[PDB]
Amino acid sequence: MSVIKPDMKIKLRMEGAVNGHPFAIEGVGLGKPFEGKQSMDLKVKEGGPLPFAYDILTTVFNRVFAKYPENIVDYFKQSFPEGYSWERSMNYEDGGICNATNDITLDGDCYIYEIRFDGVNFPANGPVMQKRTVKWEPSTEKLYVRDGVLKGDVNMALSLEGGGHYRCDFKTTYKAKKVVQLPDYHFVDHHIEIKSHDKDYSNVNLHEHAEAHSEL
């Protein structure tokens, strides 16, 4: 509560590749950690225009921005000032797979992210390479502690142009930089939206809100 303010800033850089083709994106944003809300402006710095659906990146662009009730241990807020990191596999139904990591530190009232993103085996005719995704369906992440490690799993679905969905299995491992009390199992509802973008997604305005809860 002393290194976290009702209003916080975000600075990030993502370096990455999709199907072996490299790219980099930088972002700046704002958020309300206790309200579980955030927004950010993202700019493609290298490898533009991106030949893949931007939606594969958006959930990689911090569970600090999740509203936690009093009765659920908040692993993420408790991590700071030191911070935490996470690793995630995102396994898509057509065999496309993306691995991502984020190392999250704090400078003043500003979270700083170092992000790496690597996706392979997206088919040329699939909805990722053909840019036929519309948005992520609102989701519920399942958080749980196994073997002394905090994990989060979520069954995700992208809506597709013309209807239908393209599914993805998310598996995240979270790791605080210092000893932090582990939580009981719980859920975090997520809503994520690209609110605006330019023609080829070189500029993107991104919004998320998230709320933790005990029961389904």
PDB file of C-alpha atoms in Angstrom:
ATOM      1  CA  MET A   1       0.000   0.000   0.000  1.00  0.00           C
ATOM      2  CA  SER A   2       3.059   2.294   0.228  1.00  0.00           C
ATOM      3  CA  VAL A   3       4.614   1.496  -3.165  1.00  0.00           C
ATOM      4  CA  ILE A   4       1.195   1.227  -4.845  1.00  0.00           C
ATOM      5  CA  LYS A   5      -1.001   4.257  -5.633  1.00  0.00           C
ATOM      6  CA  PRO A   6      -4.653   4.368  -6.843  1.00  0.00           C
ATOM      7  CA  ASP A   7      -3.208   5.651 -10.167  1.00  0.00           C
ATOM      8  CA  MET A   8      -0.155   3.985 -11.733  1.00  0.00           C
ATOM      9  CA  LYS A   9       1.798   4.227 -14.996  1.00  0.00           C
ATOM     10  CA  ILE A  10       2.981   1.493 -17.396  1.00  0.00           C
ATOM     11  CA  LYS A  11       6.013   1.364 -19.716  1.00  0.00           C
ATOM     12  CA  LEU A  12       6.835  -1.729 -21.757  1.00  0.00           C
ATOM     13  CA  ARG A  13       8.885  -3.193 -24.559  1.00  0.00           C
ATOM     14  CA  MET A  14       8.050  -6.491 -26.269  1.00  0.00           C
ATOM     15  CA  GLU A  15      10.655  -8.207 -28.415  1.00  0.00           C
ATOM     16  CA  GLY A  16       9.516 -11.246 -30.319  1.00  0.00           C
ATOM     17  CA  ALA A  17       8.882 -13.327 -33.422  1.00  0.00           C
ATOM     18  CA  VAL A  18       5.975 -15.136 -35.089  1.00  0.00           C
ATOM     19  CA  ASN A  19       6.778 -17.996 -37.518  1.00  0.00           C
ATOM     20  CA  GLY A  20      10.438 -16.911 -37.308  1.00  0.00           C
ATOM     21  CA  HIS A  21       9.793 -13.297 -38.329  1.00  0.00           C
ATOM     22  CA  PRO A  22      11.043 -10.816 -35.699  1.00  0.00           C
ATOM     23  CA  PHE A  23       9.236  -7.704 -34.371  1.00  0.00           C
ATOM     24  CA  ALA A  24       9.329  -5.197 -31.461  1.00  0.00           C
ATOM     25  CA  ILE A  25       6.551  -3.115 -29.876  1.00  0.00           C
ATOM     26  CA  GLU A  26       6.794  -0.359 -27.234  1.00  0.00           C
ATOM     27  CA  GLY A  27       3.928   0.823 -25.024  1.00  0.00           C
ATOM     28  CA  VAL A  28       2.925   3.490 -22.514  1.00  0.00           C
ATOM     29  CA  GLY A  29      -0.224   3.376 -20.350  1.00  0.00           C
ATOM     30  CA  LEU A  30      -2.152   4.161 -17.180  1.00  0.00           C
ATOM     31  CA  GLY A  31      -4.087   2.076 -14.671  1.00  0.00           C
ATOM     32  CA  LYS A  32      -6.061   1.821 -11.465  1.00  0.00           C
ATOM     33  CA  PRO A  33      -4.761  -1.272  -9.621  1.00  0.00           C
ATOM     34  CA  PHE A  34      -7.419  -1.286  -6.879  1.00  0.00           C
ATOM     35  CA  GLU A  35     -10.150  -0.849  -9.483  1.00  0.00           C
ATOM     36  CA  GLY A  36      -8.648  -3.555 -11.716  1.00  0.00           C
ATOM     37  CA  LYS A  37      -8.568  -1.284 -14.790  1.00  0.00           C
ATOM     38  CA  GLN A  38      -5.871  -0.304 -17.306  1.00  0.00           C
ATOM     39  CA  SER A  39      -5.322   1.135 -20.765  1.00  0.00           C
ATOM     40  CA  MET A  40      -2.259   1.606 -22.951  1.00  0.00           C
ATOM     41  CA  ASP A  41      -0.996   2.890 -26.292  1.00  0.00           C
ATOM     42  CA  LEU A  42       1.127   0.461 -28.258  1.00  0.00           C
ATOM     43  CA  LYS A  43       3.449   1.279 -31.155  1.00  0.00           C
ATOM     44  CA  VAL A  44       5.095  -1.160 -33.535  1.00  0.00           C
ATOM     45  CA  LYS A  45       8.802  -0.230 -33.620  1.00  0.00           C
ATOM     46  CA  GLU A  46      10.241  -3.105 -35.699  1.00  0.00           C
ATOM     47  CA  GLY A  47       8.901  -5.661 -38.188  1.00  0.00           C
ATOM     48  CA  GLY A  48       5.853  -3.677 -39.294  1.00  0.00           C
ATOM     49  CA  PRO A  49       3.362  -3.995 -40.731  1.00  0.00           C
ATOM     50  CA  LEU A  50       2.650  -7.092 -38.623  1.00  0.00           C
ATOM     51  CA  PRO A  51       1.637 -10.073 -40.852  1.00  0.00           C
ATOM     52  CA  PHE A  52      -0.333 -11.712 -38.021  1.00  0.00           C
ATOM     53  CA  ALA A  53      -3.469 -11.060 -35.926  1.00  0.00           C
ATOM     54  CA  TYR A  54      -2.653  -8.485 -33.226  1.00  0.00           C
ATOM     55  CA  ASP A  55      -5.064 -10.341 -30.876  1.00  0.00           C
ATOM     56  CA  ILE A  56      -2.331 -12.945 -30.202  1.00  0.00           C
ATOM     57  CA  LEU A  57      -0.298 -10.229 -28.380  1.00  0.00           C
ATOM     58  CA  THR A  58      -2.882  -8.416 -26.311  1.00  0.00           C
ATOM     59  CA  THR A  59      -3.079 -10.655 -23.226  1.00  0.00           C
ATOM     60  CA  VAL A  60       0.725 -10.440 -23.047  1.00  0.00           C
ATOM     61  CA  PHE A  61       0.543  -6.615 -22.880  1.00  0.00           C
ATOM     62  CA  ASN A  62      -0.023  -7.710 -15.239  1.00  0.00           C
ATOM     63  CA  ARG A  63      -2.362  -9.100 -12.568  1.00  0.00           C
ATOM     64  CA  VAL A  64      -1.642  -6.067 -10.334  1.00  0.00           C
ATOM     65  CA  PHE A  65      -4.474  -4.545 -12.383  1.00  0.00           C
ATOM     66  CA  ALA A  66      -7.132  -6.845 -10.928  1.00  0.00           C
ATOM     67  CA  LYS A  67      -9.631  -5.855  -8.243  1.00  0.00           C
ATOM     68  CA  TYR A  68      -9.049  -8.137  -5.249  1.00  0.00           C
ATOM     69  CA  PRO A  69     -11.652  -8.440  -2.476  1.00  0.00           C
ATOM     70  CA  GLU A  70     -10.499  -8.274   1.166  1.00  0.00           C
ATOM     71  CA  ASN A  71     -10.976 -12.041   1.662  1.00  0.00           C
ATOM     72  CA  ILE A  72      -8.577 -13.130  -1.129  1.00  0.00           C
ATOM     73  CA  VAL A  73      -4.778 -12.952  -0.749  1.00  0.00           C
ATOM     74  CA  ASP A  74      -3.354 -10.581  -3.370  1.00  0.00           C
ATOM     75  CA  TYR A  75      -0.073 -12.157  -4.494  1.00  0.00           C
ATOM     76  CA  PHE A  76       0.601  -9.479  -7.100  1.00  0.00           C
ATOM     77  CA  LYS A  77       0.171  -6.263  -5.112  1.00  0.00           C
ATOM     78  CA  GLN A  78       2.188  -7.853  -2.257  1.00  0.00           C
ATOM     79  CA  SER A  79       5.141  -8.566  -4.596  1.00  0.00           C
ATOM     80  CA  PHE A  80       6.138  -4.915  -4.910  1.00  0.00           C
ATOM     81  CA  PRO A  81       8.427  -2.946  -4.696  1.00  0.00           C
ATOM     82  CA  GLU A  82      10.530  -5.946  -5.861  1.00  0.00           C
ATOM     83  CA  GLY A  83       7.957  -7.136  -8.424  1.00  0.00           C
ATOM     84  CA  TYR A  84       7.265 -10.441 -10.102  1.00  0.00           C
ATOM     85  CA  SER A  85       7.588 -12.257 -13.427  1.00  0.00           C
ATOM     86  CA  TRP A  86       5.414 -14.655 -15.341  1.00  0.00           C
ATOM     87  CA  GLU A  87       5.811 -17.278 -18.093  1.00  0.00           C
ATOM     88  CA  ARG A  88       2.953 -18.494 -20.266  1.00  0.00           C
ATOM     89  CA  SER A  89       2.224 -21.053 -23.015  1.00  0.00           C
ATOM     90  CA  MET A  90      -0.707 -20.313 -25.306  1.00  0.00           C
ATOM     91  CA  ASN A  91      -1.711 -23.418 -27.186  1.00  0.00           C
ATOM     92  CA  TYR A  92      -4.080 -22.752 -30.103  1.00  0.00           C
ATOM     93  CA  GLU A  93      -6.493 -25.349 -31.488  1.00  0.00           C
ATOM     94  CA  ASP A  94      -4.772 -25.528 -34.909  1.00  0.00           C
ATOM     95  CA  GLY A  95      -1.342 -26.231 -33.353  1.00  0.00           C
ATOM     96  CA  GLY A  96      -0.065 -22.642 -33.408  1.00  0.00           C
ATOM     97  CA  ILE A  97       1.764 -22.131 -30.077  1.00  0.00           C
ATOM     98  CA  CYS A  98       2.999 -18.922 -28.432  1.00  0.00           C
ATOM     99  CA  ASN A  99       5.343 -18.731 -25.436  1.00  0.00           C
ATOM    100  CA  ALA A 100       5.675 -15.439 -23.573  1.00  0.00           C
ATOM    101  CA  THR A 101       7.481 -14.105 -20.527  1.00  0.00           C
ATOM    102  CA  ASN A 102       7.195 -10.790 -18.690  1.00  0.00           C
ATOM    103  CA  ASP A 103       9.553  -9.389 -16.076  1.00  0.00           C
ATOM    104  CA  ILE A 104       7.747  -6.653 -14.140  1.00  0.00           C
ATOM    105  CA  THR A 105       9.594  -4.035 -12.092  1.00  0.00           C
ATOM    106  CA  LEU A 106       8.590  -0.711 -10.543  1.00  0.00           C
ATOM    107  CA  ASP A 107      10.193   2.714 -10.853  1.00  0.00           C
ATOM    108  CA  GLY A 108       8.359   5.426  -8.891  1.00  0.00           C
ATOM    109  CA  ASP A 109       4.671   5.042  -9.774  1.00  0.00           C
ATOM    110  CA  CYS A 110       5.551   3.309 -13.049  1.00  0.00           C
ATOM    111  CA  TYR A 111       5.486  -0.426 -13.793  1.00  0.00           C
ATOM    112  CA  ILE A 112       8.158  -1.435 -16.306  1.00  0.00           C
ATOM    113  CA  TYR A 113       7.715  -4.630 -18.357  1.00  0.00           C
ATOM    114  CA  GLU A 114      10.385  -6.580 -20.238  1.00  0.00           C
ATOM    115  CA  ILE A 115       8.429  -8.936 -22.487  1.00  0.00           C
ATOM    116  CA  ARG A 116       9.470 -11.739 -24.831  1.00  0.00           C
ATOM    117  CA  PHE A 117       7.032 -13.364 -27.262  1.00  0.00           C
ATOM    118  CA  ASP A 118       7.592 -16.323 -29.602  1.00  0.00           C
ATOM    119  CA  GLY A 119       4.940 -18.029 -31.725  1.00  0.00           C
ATOM    120  CA  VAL A 120       5.463 -20.881 -34.194  1.00  0.00           C
ATOM    121  CA  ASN A 121       3.489 -23.140 -36.536  1.00  0.00           C
ATOM    122  CA  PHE A 122       0.610 -20.785 -37.362  1.00  0.00           C
ATOM    123  CA  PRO A 123      -0.738 -22.104 -40.728  1.00  0.00           C
ATOM    124  CA  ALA A 124      -0.678 -19.695 -43.677  1.00  0.00           C
ATOM    125  CA  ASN A 125      -4.443 -20.167 -44.222  1.00  0.00           C
ATOM    126  CA  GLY A 126      -5.413 -20.009 -40.526  1.00  0.00           C
ATOM    127  CA  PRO A 127      -7.179 -17.094 -38.796  1.00  0.00           C
ATOM    128  CA  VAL A 128      -3.964 -15.743 -37.218  1.00  0.00           C
ATOM    129  CA  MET A 129      -1.943 -15.343 -40.420  1.00  0.00           C
ATOM    130  CA  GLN A 130      -5.073 -14.313 -42.368  1.00  0.00           C
ATOM    131  CA  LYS A 131      -6.018 -11.709 -39.716  1.00  0.00           C
ATOM    132  CA  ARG A 132      -9.553 -13.054 -39.303  1.00  0.00           C
ATOM    133  CA  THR A 133      -9.870 -12.698 -35.509  1.00  0.00           C
ATOM    134  CA  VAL A 134     -12.282 -10.202 -33.958  1.00  0.00           C
ATOM    135  CA  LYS A 135     -11.750 -10.220 -30.186  1.00  0.00           C
ATOM    136  CA  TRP A 136     -11.147 -12.323 -27.116  1.00  0.00           C
ATOM    137  CA  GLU A 137     -14.268 -13.592 -25.356  1.00  0.00           C
ATOM    138  CA  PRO A 138     -14.486 -12.508 -21.705  1.00  0.00           C
ATOM    139  CA  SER A 139     -12.776 -15.159 -19.653  1.00  0.00           C
ATOM    140  CA  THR A 140     -12.290 -16.543 -16.155  1.00  0.00           C
ATOM    141  CA  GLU A 141      -8.703 -17.345 -15.155  1.00  0.00           C
ATOM    142  CA  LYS A 142      -8.367 -20.141 -12.568  1.00  0.00           C
ATOM    143  CA  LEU A 143      -5.593 -19.375 -10.082  1.00  0.00           C
ATOM    144  CA  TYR A 144      -4.193 -22.084  -7.834  1.00  0.00           C
ATOM    145  CA  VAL A 145      -1.056 -23.005  -5.960  1.00  0.00           C
ATOM    146  CA  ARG A 146       0.615 -26.248  -6.837  1.00  0.00           C
ATOM    147  CA  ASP A 147       3.929 -27.441  -5.366  1.00  0.00           C
ATOM    148  CA  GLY A 148       4.535 -23.981  -3.829  1.00  0.00           C
ATOM    149  CA  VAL A 149       4.094 -22.147  -7.140  1.00  0.00           C
ATOM    150  CA  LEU A 150       1.247 -19.833  -8.218  1.00  0.00           C
ATOM    151  CA  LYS A 151      -0.343 -20.889 -11.522  1.00  0.00           C
ATOM    152  CA  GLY A 152      -3.171 -19.497 -13.635  1.00  0.00           C
ATOM    153  CA  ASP A 153      -5.051 -21.452 -16.322  1.00  0.00           C
ATOM    154  CA  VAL A 154      -7.688 -20.176 -18.715  1.00  0.00           C
ATOM    155  CA  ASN A 155      -9.666 -21.572 -21.637  1.00  0.00           C
ATOM    156  CA  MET A 156      -9.651 -18.707 -24.084  1.00  0.00           C
ATOM    157  CA  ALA A 157     -11.573 -18.161 -27.336  1.00  0.00           C
ATOM    158  CA  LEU A 158     -11.137 -15.627 -30.122  1.00  0.00           C
ATOM    159  CA  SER A 159     -14.295 -14.735 -32.007  1.00  0.00           C
ATOM    160  CA  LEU A 160     -13.817 -15.028 -35.783  1.00  0.00           C
ATOM    161  CA  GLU A 161     -14.867 -12.847 -38.724  1.00  0.00           C
ATOM    162  CA  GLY A 162     -18.126 -14.359 -39.998  1.00  0.00           C
ATOM    163  CA  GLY A 163     -18.848 -16.113 -36.692  1.00  0.00           C
ATOM    164  CA  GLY A 164     -17.459 -19.020 -34.696  1.00  0.00           C
ATOM    165  CA  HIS A 165     -14.424 -19.231 -32.448  1.00  0.00           C
ATOM    166  CA  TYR A 166     -10.763 -20.195 -32.458  1.00  0.00           C
ATOM    167  CA  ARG A 167      -9.759 -21.641 -29.073  1.00  0.00           C
ATOM    168  CA  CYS A 168      -6.552 -21.430 -27.050  1.00  0.00           C
ATOM    169  CA  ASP A 169      -5.351 -23.035 -23.813  1.00  0.00           C
ATOM    170  CA  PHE A 170      -3.441 -20.569 -21.558  1.00  0.00           C
ATOM    171  CA  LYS A 171      -1.025 -21.867 -18.897  1.00  0.00           C
ATOM    172  CA  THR A 172       0.741 -19.234 -16.791  1.00  0.00           C
ATOM    173  CA  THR A 173       3.295 -19.556 -13.976  1.00  0.00           C
ATOM    174  CA  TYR A 174       3.742 -16.509 -11.702  1.00  0.00           C
ATOM    175  CA  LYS A 175       6.874 -15.882  -9.619  1.00  0.00           C
ATOM    176  CA  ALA A 176       7.361 -13.085  -7.039  1.00  0.00           C
ATOM    177  CA  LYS A 177      10.926 -11.738  -6.598  1.00  0.00           C
ATOM    178  CA  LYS A 178      10.633 -12.004  -2.799  1.00  0.00           C
ATOM    179  CA  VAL A 179       8.784 -14.301  -0.366  1.00  0.00           C
ATOM    180  CA  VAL A 180       5.078 -13.473  -0.626  1.00  0.00           C
ATOM    181  CA  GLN A 181       2.104 -15.228   1.017  1.00  0.00           C
ATOM    182  CA  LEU A 182       0.526 -17.624  -1.483  1.00  0.00           C
ATOM    183  CA  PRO A 183      -3.268 -17.303  -2.055  1.00  0.00           C
ATOM    184  CA  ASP A 184      -6.026 -19.897  -1.799  1.00  0.00           C
ATOM    185  CA  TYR A 185      -7.506 -21.002  -5.138  1.00  0.00           C
ATOM    186  CA  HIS A 186      -9.660 -18.289  -6.757  1.00  0.00           C
ATOM    187  CA  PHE A 187     -10.822 -16.832 -10.097  1.00  0.00           C
ATOM    188  CA  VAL A 188     -10.089 -13.637 -12.007  1.00  0.00           C
ATOM    189  CA  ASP A 189     -12.632 -12.457 -14.581  1.00  0.00           C
ATOM    190  CA  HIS A 190     -10.991 -10.723 -17.553  1.00  0.00           C
ATOM    191  CA  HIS A 191     -12.331  -8.430 -20.275  1.00  0.00           C
ATOM    192  CA  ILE A 192      -9.851  -7.220 -22.944  1.00  0.00           C
ATOM    193  CA  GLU A 193     -10.565  -4.917 -25.904  1.00  0.00           C
ATOM    194  CA  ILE A 194      -8.676  -3.152 -28.672  1.00  0.00           C
ATOM    195  CA  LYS A 195     -10.663   0.111 -28.537  1.00  0.00           C
ATOM    196  CA  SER A 196      -8.920   1.660 -31.541  1.00  0.00           C
ATOM    197  CA  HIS A 197      -6.144   0.952 -34.034  1.00  0.00           C
ATOM    198  CA  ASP A 198      -4.721   2.262 -37.308  1.00  0.00           C
ATOM    199  CA  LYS A 199      -5.007   0.326 -40.608  1.00  0.00           C
ATOM    200  CA  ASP A 200      -2.170  -2.160 -40.005  1.00  0.00           C
ATOM    201  CA  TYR A 201      -2.219  -2.052 -36.181  1.00  0.00           C
ATOM    202  CA  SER A 202       1.034  -0.013 -35.980  1.00  0.00           C
ATOM    203  CA  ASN A 203      -0.785   2.051 -33.353  1.00  0.00           C
ATOM    204  CA  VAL A 204      -3.102   0.327 -30.880  1.00  0.00           C
ATOM    205  CA  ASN A 205      -5.170   1.548 -27.944  1.00  0.00           C
ATOM    206  CA  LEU A 206      -5.777  -1.350 -25.523  1.00  0.00           C
ATOM    207  CA  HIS A 207      -8.061  -1.698 -22.490  1.00  0.00           C
ATOM    208  CA  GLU A 208      -8.510  -4.402 -19.827  1.00  0.00           C
ATOM    209  CA  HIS A 209     -10.469  -4.766 -16.635  1.00  0.00           C
ATOM    210  CA  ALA A 210     -10.216  -7.672 -14.228  1.00  0.00           C
ATOM    211  CA  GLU A 211     -11.895  -8.707 -10.961  1.00  0.00           C
ATOM    212  CA  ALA A 212     -10.965 -11.523  -8.590  1.00  0.00           C
ATOM    213  CA  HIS A 213     -13.628 -13.641  -6.859  1.00  0.00           C
ATOM    214  CA  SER A 214     -14.041 -16.793  -4.744  1.00  0.00           C
ATOM    215  CA  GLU A 215     -17.047 -18.574  -6.236  1.00  0.00           C
ATOM    216  CA  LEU A 216     -18.331 -19.568  -9.696  1.00  0.00           C
TER     217      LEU A 216
END
